[model samples]
Target: SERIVINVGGTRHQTHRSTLRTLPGTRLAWLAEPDAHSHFDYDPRADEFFFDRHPGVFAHILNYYRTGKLHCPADVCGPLYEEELAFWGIDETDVEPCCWMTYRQHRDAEEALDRRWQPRIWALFEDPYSSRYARYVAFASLFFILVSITTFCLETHERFNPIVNKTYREAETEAFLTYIEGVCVVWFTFEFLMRVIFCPNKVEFIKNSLNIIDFVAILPFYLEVGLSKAAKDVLGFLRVVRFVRILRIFKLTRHFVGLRVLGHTLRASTNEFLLLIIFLALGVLIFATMIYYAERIGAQPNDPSASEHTHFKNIPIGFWWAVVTMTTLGYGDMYPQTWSGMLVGALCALAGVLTIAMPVPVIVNNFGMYYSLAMAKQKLPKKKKKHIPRP
Candidate 1:
């Protein structure tokens, strides 16, 4: 079978369609031609093609053939290139001359732009090992584990329990402690190794303050295993080490859309947030004091109740209870039985419903802004102007 070599010129759609019409009774006929083809044919020696087609589309297709992906064209001749370039904020200035630029030129330009911005992006990850914005992730993970471990251990101790005390025997507790320690150690080792591998320089990893915290977090575990004879008793102190781990959650700020939106809104409305915090603190304090005063009078000796409560104990607990109630989750465990206490509780609950819940609308508004920003970054089809027919 003779090969019908058709030169694809300016518009790929037109050239492709014309070629399809001309090529009859050939295997190429079976394949759907592009909407247009380039006017120029490939030259082996010069590695060049000539075209009267749109310069941007010509460069884009040429780059696509060489790199296996369509590049951002200054003016996308078709719907495809237009959308992509618009989305990425690539302008006509970024594209090269049609039939003149080499494949390497296109590749280098894209790479350079990406490289220039990659560090800024990496900074978003706060985990010292992950990226800049997320370096705190490790600490947060450690903190969460620490808190979980402390709560677990404290719950098992008889003296700490007012409601229920379930004590595990020494051997059982030891086994559980060893299991948790082993998991934490393994996780820390893996995290450290990953950080070392991905960081541009080991010095950067070492210098990061979060990295230092991460190192310290894992150190106690290692010391307990290697140096301590009474590691089991000392393991409780590891709870303190876990506090630093909570910072790891800060690293997640970069990834969570809701949190990121919230952060943006908070930054934009610092005064509002400060005011909210002030009011919230006062509400909790007022509610707690009322409950303590009212409940103390009717308290049993063993229960000791409200008389046992100080500002440190009652206020903080009340603040927490207020937070829970404001969110509309009434846990029922903490309640105000006295009339005065009930009045404060009702007010606090009402305040929680009014202030704490009001932020949802603000969050929704911020999310709309985020959506608009994302859409504006990309190019989409323009609406065609309406034309009226005259009689």
Candidate 2:
């Protein structure tokens, strides 16, 4: 019936025997037992129990007995509180629902910290909005991308292209374009190196498709430079390899949300896309056969009237005719002559419309969803302060 005195971390706390008894299986409750003096550090002269545990957390543990509500300490971390709970023989499930989230906050905080270890460096390469310098880096990368793409396009023109037998002025122009391309390639090399060096997880960074594209975008230029002294035939192969540089446009997928949304849309609607292709293939086979038979039905073998305008020479040729007619491309290279052939052509065009139209709505909806979701995420503030609730 006497009051109990406990000293934890040199902080003395006084409570009634009934308060400790309320929690029957805890360390405080054991203090109320007959063998309490034999097992624990007890000062007989002072008539008090002493524990060298954290006094701050012990306050909340004792309060749980008196109040019948277990609340976590605001200052204590999740793991330390768990340890203290185990020492006191308090069940973790007894923590109030409102305090559970706060109790688990430490693990979340630590995981986020570890995952983003190289924040500033990673942001400079990957995130355009982390800071002013990050944006500047992104803009410089964008400049090189656009400049290189422009060079690739302009050099394809007949007037701009320098041939093996080049005039004096044409060679001068081509040399200038080559110097511009070299500058852009150098910038791309620098950006790719920066990303690789500062990446937090090198394995995941290397495995990422965007990073792979970055590597591919610069490879052709170096390959061309390495093989520059080779024969004309080998240089022709290098020119074909140079076409891979067009993949540089894919590097923009990371910088712009629209391209990212488009990528996600295509990925999500892959099933619908496959279905469309399946329908098109079936239509191509059926219509190609139909047009082939119809064109040969009423025609004589060597008659000029039957063979003059009819383009369906065989089933293989009908395959090309079917594709062009169905897609409404109507390349005018092939046409149906007889009435039955025209009927087959009409059905092919209608089937193509139906086949192509069905999957479009699903793809468009996916695009809209990803676009809005990305826009919503962009509106969120970059740095968020911890929001601890008031108890």
Candidate 3:
């Protein structure tokens, strides 16, 4: 019996048992011989070459017919041959020799192939902690710090006014200020929560001095806003809590190299920092007393009432004024009127200059050491290969 077929646009249809013809746009032709197995078969109707034995190759034949190109599977060719066997109704045991194998055998081969590829995939996942993600997170954190610092500068300039500015009458400025505050509050809150959750040790995370600093950094906002009712004034001096926002600049240690170095220096030389603080406190106290004594007689006469003289009014005010002068940012609002007090203020200022400026070398050297240690910890471990002994 003869079979008649028609092909058009790579599609084949059986017509009848009488005749076969090609419709149009025919490409290649091949002849199939009987008895011996022939992979190639000719479609008379389409005048096309195809693999008759492997129906799986029909997809490639169709592709070739349409695109004038041959397509073959580079990988998973075994599965392709298996699909051809099922298509032809041939038993797997009687199929011609090829890569086609049992399902389990094919699966095992794939597993072996994957073992060779696993290291590359694992390296991709690990790369971030060692290089990219950590660095990117650090840069992002530095940028966030700069933004936070700018916010602090603006707030300080406005004396931490919740109303945004003194000149602007628009409610929009107030709204924008509130929006920025809300964003910073939300961001820090989320960061704190995520750190707590993902930390290797929950107790340690909470107890960590750095984490505690982060908590304090965001604490002022919660206090001013969350405990608003207790506040005496909406724009009270307590708004100084917003200054705590500048402490967030320290939290950038988790990201920035310079900050991380500073952190390590502080950690390594805790006693030195403590001593620095002690000296600073003593200096402030000494200057406050000198200003109080010197300014008392000249400025206020008869043992100037505590309320009358700025020094007698609040010793800490004199101390803070001394600190400001020492830091070379004299606001000029507070100063010693007596000659003795002026001399004491000058001495304190010199002491402050020496104390604050001397730590630069210590901080820079410690930072270099910290970076080296961090890099060393990130190196990949060496792998040892086992040698088989000959029997």
Candidate 4:
């Protein structure tokens, strides 16, 4: 086989023509092609083709063509150096699976830095890596969720407010339970404002779903405070708008990768979830009808009384019992004394099992893949690199 001399980044290599031609459409093959429009500037003096690239990594690339194996360099990051092979028109499939995972993290980390720079500050907004800011904000959000939920409960406590006010009286905030609400509102407002102020991209910042959640979460609090008692109260019963504050919990998806992945899994498994719901709906209808017929018209195998199953008066009313049975939560308050009704209950339970089983594979696969990626990312050391080392 004839040999050709090449100089990549001033490093010399005498590569065989046969080895270079193994893969079609590669830069090597292009170079080996006769009468091709030459992209390289001919180094007539040195009688070698010259390229401006990382020679250290290029050595491994050339070796791959020679030996039919790609070995990633330990000192060089996978994704960063993969660019070299990409430039040379080599396939990434040549890389070992383990090294590919490293490459994945390298890409994700690069994206993270692009999204939020000035680490110590950006960490304040969101960071899956080791950042006290990320941890503190996440913990605070959790505490906010707990205290806010408790505040909702406390405000509605029958013992606390014997008189159910038709509407939120601004003066009602003077009460102790309302004091917690005020404190939570202030902290969350400040947190939301600070994040918007500090974030790198203003448009991108405002566009984020988490930011929208934070805005909505904080807005409900202010509206509840700013509105007249009549506006806050709806239909003379429920404070419908106040419930919007619960959306603040969604801010966790921004901080916690696991929860974000869970959201994605739910979205990806929509087909399976829909199937589960369809089966559940069908089962509920089927069992509800069976229970109604057994209690109202059908002959009981043991002539069982409808006393325990008094709720099964009609098709509509029996839906509650059917749902309970299908979910395996019989609640004991409702039971069919007749063998036919017992059989319906058992069928609903078995149907519930099958319906639940259908979506498990897709859901489990999403969770499995998500954790494996998280586990792979965990393998990288928490070293602060000042410079992105070029291969």
Off by over 4 Å in 3: 1-253, 299-314, 354-391
For every candidate, C-alpha RMSD to the true structure in Å? 19.0, 13.2, 27.9, 8.9
Q: What are the per-model numbers of colliding residue pairs?
A: 42, 0, 2, 0
How do these models rank on lDDT, best leading? 2, 4, 3, 1
Query: Once all C-alphas are superposed, what RMSD does model 2 give against the true structure?
Result: 13.2
**How high is each candidate's TM-score?**
0.40, 0.60, 0.39, 0.58
Judge candidate 4 at residue 188 and give its lDDT. 82
- Cα distance off (Å), candidate 4, residue 77: 21
Cα lDDT, all candidates: 0.53, 0.79, 0.56, 0.72
Query: Where does model 4 exceed 4 Å of error?
Result: 1-123, 126-146, 164-174, 198-203, 224-238, 298-309, 381-391
lDDT of 1 by residue, 1-391 (tens): 2222322354332233334344333322332233112323545454333333344444454344334444444343334554444442334344444422432333332332225765654553344567634556645555655754564565467554434344753422445545666676776667576555557776876887667866876677677546545665666666676556555444434454456544555555555567667767776777666656655555547754434433224566777777777767998877676566677678778878887766556555655655444344344567566776659
Tens digit of per-residue lDDT, candidate 3, span 50-108: 33344335444434334533333334455665565345333445332332233334433
User: What TM-score would candidate 2 get against the native?
Assistant: 0.60
Model 1: CA > 4 A from native: 1-169, 173-194, 197-214, 225-234, 242-269, 288-327, 338-345, 357-360, 371-391
Best by TM-score: 2
